[PDB]
From Swiss-Prot, chain B:
Glycosylation site list: T25, S27, N33, N45
Name assigned to this protein: Spike protein S1
Lineage: Viruses, Riboviria, Orthornavirae, Pisuviricota, Pisoniviricetes
Region of interest: Disordered: 21-37
Job description of the protein: Attaches the virion to the cell membrane by interacting with host receptor, initiating the infection. The major receptor is host ACE2. When S2/S2' has been cleaved, binding to the receptor triggers direct fusion at the cell membrane. When S2/S2' has not been cleaved, binding to the receptor results in internalization of the virus by endocytosis using host TFRC and GRM2 and leading to fusion of the virion membrane with the host endosomal membrane. Alternatively, may use NRP1/NRP2 and integrin as entry receptors.
Organism: Severe acute respiratory syndrome coronavirus 2
Domain of life of the organism encoding this protein: Viruses
Residues included from the entire protein: 299 to 347 of 1273
Assembly description: Binds to host ACE2. RBD also interacts with the N-linked glycan on 'Asn-90' of ACE2. Cleavage of S generates a polybasic C-terminal sequence on S1 that binds to host Neuropilin-1 (NRP1) and Neuropilin-2 (NRP2) receptors. Interacts with host integrin alpha-5/beta-1 (ITGA5:ITGB1) and with ACE2 in complex with integrin alpha-5/beta-1 (ITGA5:ITGB1). May interact via cytoplasmic c-terminus with M protein. May interact (via N-terminus) with host bilirubin and biliverdin, thereby preventing antibody binding to the SARS-CoV-2 spike NTD via an allosteric mechanism.
Effect of N45Q: Reduced viral infectivity
Length: 125, 49
């Protein structure tokens, strides 16, 4: 129904940079709080960053803090994440997921319902 | 009977003095079974303001 497709990842050298793009289809991405989940190869998932619907509340992961910027292209109706100065420990798959309870009278706990397909990034020589 | 005729001496006869009426022994109220409530635990329990 509603998909969250990724694009821009793959292999890179350490020190270099990269940009991940999150494309929303099936609904309007300009008013749904988003946040990224990274999953290294053969491990669980891990939080990356977070954009709000407002655009004024942003919470990053403590390790990618200071770099690895996130944003949304409300013109192109995407989410953008530019990975800058990567190191060897960032190899993982990345998912772009949207928070379910985005109404004003929800009375329901949080849950990332629309999940991303996920694409891999590999950082080495 | 003396008090109703307002006279200390009553002559022979039959007199209608007063009335009696069984009192109610209980009080009951019957209303419809309270049903279509309003959404309050929907405004205080909101997850995001």
């Amino acid at each position: 129904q509603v998909q969250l497709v990724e694009s821009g990842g793959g292999l890179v050298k350490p020190g270099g940079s990269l940009r991940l793009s999150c494309a929303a289809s099936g609904f309007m991405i300009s008013d749904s709080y988003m946040n990224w989940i990274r999953q290294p190869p053969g491990k669980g998932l891990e939080w990356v960053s977070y954009i709000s619907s407002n655009g004024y509340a942003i919470y990053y992961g403590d390790s990618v803090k200071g770099r690895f910027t996130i944003s949304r292209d409300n013109a192109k109706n995407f989410l953008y994440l530019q990975m800058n100065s990567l190191r060897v420990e960032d190899t993982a798959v990345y998912y772009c997921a949207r928070e379910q309870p985005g109404g004003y009278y929800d009375s329901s706990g949080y849950r990332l319902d629309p999940w991303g397909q996920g694409i891999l990034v590999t950082v080495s020589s | 009977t003396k008090c109703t005729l307002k006279s200390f001496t009553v002559e022979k006869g039959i007199y209608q003095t007063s009335n009696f009426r069984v009192q109610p022994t209980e009080s009951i109220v019957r209303f419809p079974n309270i049903t279509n409530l309003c959404p309050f635990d929907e405004v205080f329990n909101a997850t995001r303001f």
